[PDB]
Design an enzyme around this catalytic site. Sequence first.
Site, PDB file in Angstrom:
ATOM      1  N   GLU A 144       3.470   5.938  -3.479  1.00  0.00           N
ATOM      2  CA  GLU A 144       2.666   5.561  -2.405  1.00  0.00           C
ATOM      3  C   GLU A 144       3.587   5.212  -1.286  1.00  0.00           C
ATOM      4  O   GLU A 144       4.960   4.704  -1.660  1.00  0.00           O
ATOM      5  CB  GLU A 144       1.963   4.398  -2.485  1.00  0.00           C
ATOM      6  CG  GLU A 144       1.393   3.706  -1.380  1.00  0.00           C
ATOM      7  CD  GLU A 144       0.561   2.404  -1.831  1.00  0.00           C
ATOM      8  OE1 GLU A 144      -0.218   1.900  -1.078  1.00  0.00           O
ATOM      9  OE2 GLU A 144       0.971   2.038  -2.904  1.00  0.00           O
ATOM     10  N   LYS A 184      -5.993   6.043   2.407  1.00  0.00           N
ATOM     11  CA  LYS A 184      -6.455   5.107   1.274  1.00  0.00           C
ATOM     12  C   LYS A 184      -7.434   4.405   1.848  1.00  0.00           C
ATOM     13  O   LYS A 184      -7.826   3.366   2.595  1.00  0.00           O
ATOM     14  CB  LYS A 184      -5.193   4.117   0.907  1.00  0.00           C
ATOM     15  CG  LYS A 184      -5.426   3.076  -0.211  1.00  0.00           C
ATOM     16  CD  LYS A 184      -4.001   2.229  -0.400  1.00  0.00           C
ATOM     17  CE  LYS A 184      -4.338   1.467  -1.461  1.00  0.00           C
ATOM     18  NZ  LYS A 184      -2.889   0.945  -1.742  1.00  0.00           N
ATOM     19  N   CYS A 217      -2.749   4.378  -5.212  1.00  0.00           N
ATOM     20  CA  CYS A 217      -2.522   3.013  -5.625  1.00  0.00           C
ATOM     21  C   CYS A 217      -3.765   2.233  -6.425  1.00  0.00           C
ATOM     22  O   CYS A 217      -4.601   2.916  -7.015  1.00  0.00           O
ATOM     23  CB  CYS A 217      -1.982   2.337  -4.541  1.00  0.00           C
ATOM     24  SG  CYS A 217      -1.277   0.788  -4.734  1.00  0.00           S
TER      25      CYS A 217
END
Lengths: 261, 261
Positions: B41, B112, B145
């Site tokens: 990430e 994300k 993540c």
Amino acid sequence: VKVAYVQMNPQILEPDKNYSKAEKLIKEASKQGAQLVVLPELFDTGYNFETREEVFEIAQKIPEGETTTFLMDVARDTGVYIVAGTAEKDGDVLYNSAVVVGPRGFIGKYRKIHLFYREKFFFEPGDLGFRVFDLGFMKVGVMICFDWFFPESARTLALKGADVIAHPANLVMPYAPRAMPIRALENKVYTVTADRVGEERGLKFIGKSLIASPKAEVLSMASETEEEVGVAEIDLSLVRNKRINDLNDIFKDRREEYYFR
Amino acid sequence: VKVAYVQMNPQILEPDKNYSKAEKLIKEASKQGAQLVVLPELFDTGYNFETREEVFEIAQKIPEGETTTFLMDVARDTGVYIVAGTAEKDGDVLYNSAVVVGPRGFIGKYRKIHLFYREKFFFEPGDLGFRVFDLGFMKVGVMICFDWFFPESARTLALKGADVIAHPANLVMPYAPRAMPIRALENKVYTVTADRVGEERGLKFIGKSLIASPKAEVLSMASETEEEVGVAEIDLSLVRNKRINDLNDIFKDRREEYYFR
Ligand SMILES: [Mg+2]
């Protein structure tokens, strides 16, 4: 509050033998302080049937039939709440069910939603959805066995406010014991997997019953082969507050508009 | 086909240094036969920001900006496909994104969906959903993540036909490496978690990048602190057939009527 699994070796097609063993172990759990006791999947009939007839012949109605009324009696005598897997007869059909009883009587039932392997030959898929039973002092969700495999099972129960997920199981694959702490973690709930032990007509069950916390810690885990009871205290606050830090709450942070599409 | 993680230590606000480190490790994964290489990430900018402005002034646009053009050069040179976490400048706004590039150039991006902790001060929540990119020889899902925490992320990717979930991460909690095998198992997919290492303005990352198989096996795992690469062969047939036995297919057996309600 203390919750417990009873890990036992149900004798196939022998409910009275299974009632006797269950009462014994539920009493041990009670004496060790448990308020909620979870028994295995199909604790009354066993699991590995050759034919539907052999189970259909002995399967009991819920709540009028012998398994439920036996469990009521034990709940009343011991003062505990019991979640137990039982074969359910409803007219011509059979479900792979779990009954929820309390010291004051019958509370409810859950019918296994995701049938495993040869279960599809005997049982109708469960049709009551994923239910959460409010005991006043706590909310108990129920799922059975292979339901663990679908993360949506535990999630649906946690979303409906389960404090603990009672999980009668007859595990044959090796995976569930390592997966259950993740189920507990990802929903911030407690889980009580009450597995059977033993060998039944060539099929071996994995035992390894366990209580997992919302921090994915294993609070109690059972042997592979022995009949036993396991008890753990549980923290209602560790589960009723979905915060994982001051910036993230599990349920606030879900974004359903982007799931499954 | 072989898939890989690159575990590196991004130096915050020093993208040129990060490009150089990435290129080195990508080549090393390529040399070991990897066809798909996943980076951490925010590998270009680093993670532990204090102001929006310090990241905004350096963040690159996708696909025309410096991070995507760098990655395209590397994919062209090495012949691999790359999934890499990068701070995306889009107009006046930033996303915490992952880019997918191959030998032909830019393939796509994911933003994300579940922001973690302080990320909410710097980035907009992702707005493209969970996308699966078809490389022909494989379909690659992408999540970033904390997306791992919500079982719905992996599940959405898998239902869309991901063979492998590429998972750039900057983990600070100890749980992901235990959970990723269960994500791989429950969806019958491969997962590639590419974690960073290092300490960044006092924040410690946990490393422990891993590749998980559809049987919940870990095929490769990295250390807590070292920069390294990890490669494993994956068997596409094992993920495309959702049967776990002659009577259970994971996707057919889902009962969405009973989920989340
Ligand atoms: Mg290693």
